[PDB]
Amino acid sequence: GTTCYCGKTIGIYWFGTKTCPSNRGYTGSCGYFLGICCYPVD
């Protein structure tokens, strides 16, 4: 699954974009392998 934990926060791994879709409610983002882990998973 595209689930990635940043520290202890459950984030979602977006493969294909560098921008967290600002239509969810993300607070933080981790630069992941060719993708971005945006948390929390909203």
Side-chain angles (χ1 to χ4, degrees):
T2 34
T3 311
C4 47
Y5 297 92
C6 289
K8 63 182 181 68
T9 314
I10 176 175
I12 187 276
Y13 169 56
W14 290 94
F15 178 75
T17 180
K18 304 175 181 179
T19 312
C20 298
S22 311
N23 63 335
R24 261 65 168 154
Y26 300 123
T27 311
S29 53
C30 304
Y32 209 75
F33 291 94
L34 202 57
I36 183 175
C37 280
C38 306
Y39 58 85
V41 181
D42 197 273

